[PDB]
Design a protein around this ligand. Structure first.
Ligand SMILES: CCCCCCCCCc1nc2cc(Cl)ccc2c(=O)n1N
Ligand SMILES: CCCCCCCCCc1nc2cc(Cl)ccc2c(=O)n1N
Lengths: 203, 203
């Protein structure tokens, strides 16, 4: 039995590809969704018995696991279109360490450099919908995965503040943390290769 | 007079594009090359009077500067083809926190998470040629920019160990740190836009 974790920031399609590919060599698979803020924390608990994690988060050397990279995805910093920072931005790119960021809480309460909020004040939430309802309201601005936002974006419900920095969307790697037991295992080596190919292909 | 820093890991072509573009709106430009390990350290010194830095290194909030991203480039972890880790790798991907890494020294002696060496023991050097002569020797393995290695690679002088992790080369962002005085300045806003376009275009 193979327990694999997938954070809320991994696009579903990625999930399917991961999921479907796993199926090829694998017979029992449990899939857990976590906040990206809680993934590494989770794998770290020895008991939780995770075997694979698919995350946007980074920690280079983890106690029992090896990192490697599955693919790339995109985040956008979004705000309600009427937000002051919205529209004219270049200062805005600087000024948002000052505006309220709706950031992703962590049960640990600690964040990597990657996920720690840029701004104070911050108001923590537990997931992206939570984060987005707030930003649509919209009390603050947030960084969200592409998928959680595409639909909204086209409507004009939401605005992209994130363009000048990293135009075209913030490029974010998708790591794969896997228990070292798996390193020799051909099933896993096969899995990785397929998924990777499929993901590039989809790109 | 506009003083701009460019680290040794920025591909020369990037340099030209940066360089040439700057020329369009700019009349005096000094260009300084630094080790990527010394760039942020350098801009940080108030006296050094840098106005732009082009680096692969990250520090999200720097005292007088704003970050944003110009483009992407590629690093490879390379070793002499006879290196034990070479060829069969998957364990190797794990085992190289154990083999000697030829890493990039820092005058500060401190490294970001991005540049801090993966492995101990490490033997520090000051630049990529230094690093490469050693690895060709080859005493250790190193992470080098694409350009510094392409020529060597095709010969078979060098091997890529870096494939399973991040196949196709390790993707690394190229940041632009610019003094905040520049944020309003149209010359700079013009520069950024052009260079970015040229870089994507070259991609
Ligand atoms: C003016 C833009 C400042 C934002 C740059 C900070 C770099 C983003 C790091 C980050 N990436 C994410 C990616 C996803 Cl898919 C989801 C959430 C985040 C996130 O919260 N952060 N911080
Ligand atoms: C088995 C591969 C482990 C290497 C993954 C570590 C992530 C690389 C971070 C890094 N990137 C660089 C990029 C360039 Cl262009 C030049 C040097 C480096 C570098 O030294 N590190 N550490």
């Amino acid at each position: 039995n193979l327990r694999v974790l997938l954070d809320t920031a991994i696009p579903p399609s990625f999930c399917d590809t991961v999921s479907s590919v796993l199926l090829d060599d694998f017979n029992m698979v449990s899939l857990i969704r976590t906040s990206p803020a809680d993934s590494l924390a989770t794998i770290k608990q020895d008991n939780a018995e995770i075997d694979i994690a698919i995350t946007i988060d980074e920690e280079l050397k983890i106690s029992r696991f090896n990192q490697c990279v599955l693919g790339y995805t995109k985040a956008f910093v979004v705000a309600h279109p009427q937000h002051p920072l919205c529209n004219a931005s270049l200062h805005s790119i600087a000024s948002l360490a000052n505006y309220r960021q709706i950031s992703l809480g962590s049960r640990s309460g600690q964040h990597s450099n990657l996920l720690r909020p840029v701004s104070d004040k911050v108001l923590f939430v537990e997931n992206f919908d939570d984060m987005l309802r707030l930003v649509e309201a919209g009390v603050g601005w947030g960084i969200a995965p592409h998928y959680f936002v595409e639909e909204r974006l086209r409507n004009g419900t939401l605005a992209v503040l994130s363009e000048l920095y990293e135009p075209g969307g913030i490029d974010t790697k998708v790591y794969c943390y896997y228990n070292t037991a798996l390193e020799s295992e051909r099933s896993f080596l096969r899995f990785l290769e397929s998924a990777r190919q499929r993901l590039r292909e989809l790109g």
